[PDB]
Design a protein around this ligand. Structure first.
Ligand SMILES: C[S@@+](CC[C@H](N)C(=O)[O-])C[C@H]1O[C@@H](n2cnc3c(N)ncnc32)[C@H](O)[C@@H]1O
Ligand SMILES: C[S@@+](CC[C@H](N)C(=O)[O-])C[C@H]1O[C@@H](n2cnc3c(N)ncnc32)[C@H](O)[C@@H]1O
Ligand SMILES: [K+]
Ligand SMILES: [K+]
Ligand SMILES: [Mg+2]
Ligand SMILES: [Mg+2]
Ligand SMILES: [Mg+2]
Ligand SMILES: [Mg+2]
Lengths: 394, 392
């Protein structure tokens, strides 16, 4: 058994970049709840005692940008200068304008084009990935780092670890075997957690609590052994956190948002964008495509690329690769995927019901990742039946 | 019939508002390293209509005019009027820059007391380096053509060939590829796309003519072009409003365009506005050197290298090498050689690649047209290292 090490990280809801992603998606949800046809490109940035929302929104919604910022900051736990931002005292800056008329005519003819004619809202390329190594058909390295980060938030909010503050990051090194291009986890090599904390707790109590309350409950017993390496607040002190410790921006966690370094990324951020922004509706459809290929048993792993030009509905390219694990040739998987999914932006919006905001639909997507999640609002997680002849059947 | 697949990479030029932000961020870094090479810099930039903000964490002995660095960067790019999407002299410049968290500074560098081999990673994360023999710069052709078409787009605006051009432009190339036992062999350019900002003096037929004869045809090798290549030339039909005026920009929103255009992998960290204790940068720069050295020494046709860190720990938590079945020796041996040849500790990388020297736009030059595949001697991570191996 020749093995290799692969590492992915995560950050929880209180990381200053993820805070911005969550605020950006709070603004989106708010615009859509009132005006489903909202054009939203909402960017957020944060530093000590400052939040700025900026970019382009055309909506009929009545929005107060200041209340959405201050509410999002509050629910996450940023309620004093001690935890790294005070939702009720921080400066909130707004530089939001309507979408360029030049973009609006090409994309959606100023709200006049029919679904099937809606152009991509920008150029770019997006990838979808899926792997049979976990039930959610995601990479184990990403899934553990992410589920450890969610746990880290949960034990802060349920009172299991009262010493926790909101800002935390995780990283997991998984030791893998390649089985004919499929990825088979062997064991967890290294676990890293860095978490903000108050001045009541010793580093021995942090190490103990993280192993017992956060790590052992999330990682399957069979991947943990007495050689697994643990780094637990390795910097030795994490009291100052959130924006007070580090400025955050929307769209600076795009690998954490997706597959943790597995598959590929076309580089587009998701948060604060309505679904004419193919960066988001396009990546979601290619995840649904990649997942459907693995879930139907057509392959053990699959990577799908799509690409767009602004004002053009049809994709410029589509790629399927199954890393040698496909049970039919990759070009027939490409033909089945092209027959089965509509990559036109106006169609993707409707097929995935992405014009619904409210009940934090998108805000929920803006921490703990966009993919591998079971909430029915994650409509791109629903597997589509695919038509093919399985080698094993007559 | 030869089996092929389509792979698409994009680029943006120096007037893209996200890329403007990367070049401001890295202009700040330059100014800081030119006066104080031990400068700790995490300089973030964002921009919208008539507005640039610099923010984040700088500890430097340097005496810096942030406001003049912003304006001079906006000016040399060409944002000199509201008509081209930002005026370097009119716009509001906001600054929310403060000193690095002492909790980070103690753990990372012991407030400037830790020796190089003991220097902590400034953060956790992971970082990928890639190389492929398909071009002479050992970059993927999809990425190279998109990138070099965008740099030509800027060059024909500056040199006065196409006087209707404004600063903000995007490109995208779809390449048709043959898989030759894991090695990537480019067959042809399937689709070329350009969207460029433009004044009111030019017609769409003049744009499409000029973009093909002045911009595309000079850059793309003839052997890759044919009478079936698809060309999307300003497909939105109108691009007069541009720059920050048409789209908010942010530092670190072009990390794929900064790297390998969707080939290899990305750990998700941004480069621009960071000093070298930031393993996001020094980490990705050394794994590029390692990947490039494996391919350039003839050990493989393609190579991916991952490295990972924990904050405050000098040694990486993991390394992986994969050659996609092109390695002439087993990957576990290539890993052994890379570990023996490359020092991944952040204090060591900084000195070995000379990353503590800025000025003369050392980093500002990496903040557009990509950090890899360039032969400027300032790109010390492009220098190939000899590797000791026995060719089978
Ligand atoms: C280490 S900071 C990034 C570097 C920072 N811009 C600087 O000036 O060095 C990145 C993230 O690590 C976490 N972090 C902040 N302070 C930390 C500390 N003292 N120890 C460990 N992790 C910390 C927070 O999640 C923060 O957003
Ligand atoms: C189209 S904008 C992204 C979406 C935008 N935030 C919105 O409100 O729809 C992204 C980039 O496309 C380019 N762009 C801007 N205006 C354009 C136009 N009218 N036609 C084509 N490309 C344009 C610029 O490079 C800009 O930074
Ligand atoms: K930052
Ligand atoms: K934007
Ligand atoms: Mg960040
Ligand atoms: Mg983009
Ligand atoms: Mg952008
Ligand atoms: Mg990072």
């Amino acid at each position: 058994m020749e093995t290799f090490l692969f590492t992915s990280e995560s950050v929880n809801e209180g990381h200053p970049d993820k805070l911005c992603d969550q605020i950006s998606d709070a603004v989106l949800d708010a615009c859509l709840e009132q005006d489903p046809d909202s054009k939203v490109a909402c960017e957020t940035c944060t530093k000590t005692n400052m939040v700025m929302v900026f970019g382009e929104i055309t909506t009929k919604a009545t929005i107060d940008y200041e209340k959405i910022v201050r509410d999002t900051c509050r629910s996450i736990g940023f309620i004093s200068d001690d935890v790294g931002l005070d939702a009720d005292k921080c400066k909130v800056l707004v530089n939001i304008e309507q979408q360029s008329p030049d973009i609006a005519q090409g994309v959606h003819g100023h709200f006049t084009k029919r679904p099937e004619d809606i152009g991509a809202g920008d150029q770019g390329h997006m990838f979808g990935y899926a792997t049979d190594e976990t039930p959610e058909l995601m990479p184990l390295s990403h899934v553990l780092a992410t589920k450890i980060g969610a746990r880290l938030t949960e034990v802060r909010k349920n009172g299991t670890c009262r010493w926790l503050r909101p800002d935390g990051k995780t990283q997991v090194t998984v030791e893998y075997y390649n089985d004919n291009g499929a990825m088979v986890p062997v064991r967890v090599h290294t676990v890293l957690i860095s978490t903000q904390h108050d001045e009541t707790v010793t580093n021995d109590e942090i190490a103990r609590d993280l192993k017992e309350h956060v790590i052992k409950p999330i990682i399957p017993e069979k991947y943990l052994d007495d050689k697994t390496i643990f780094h637990l607040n390795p910097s030795g002190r994490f009291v100052i956190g959130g924006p007070h410790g580090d400025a955050g921006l929307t769209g600076r966690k795009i690998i954490i948002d997706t597959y943790g370094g597995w598959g590929a990324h076309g580089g587009g951020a998701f948060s604060g964008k309505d679904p004419t922004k193919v960066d988001r509706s396009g990546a979601y459809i290619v995840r649904q495509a990649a997942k459907s290929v693995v879930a139907n048993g057509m392959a053990r792993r699959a990577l799908v690329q799509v690409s767009y030009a602004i004002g053009v509905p049809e994709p410029l390219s589509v790629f399927v690769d199954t890393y040698g694990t496909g049970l039919i040739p990759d070009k027939e998987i490409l033909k089945i995927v092209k027959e089965t999914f509509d990559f036109r932006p106006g169609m993707m919006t409707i097929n995935l019901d992405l014009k619904r905001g409210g009940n934090g639909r998108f805000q929920k997507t803006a921490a703990y990742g966009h993919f591998g999640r079971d909430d029915p609002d994650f409509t791109w997680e629903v597997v589509k039946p695919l038509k093919w002849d399985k080698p094993q059947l007559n």
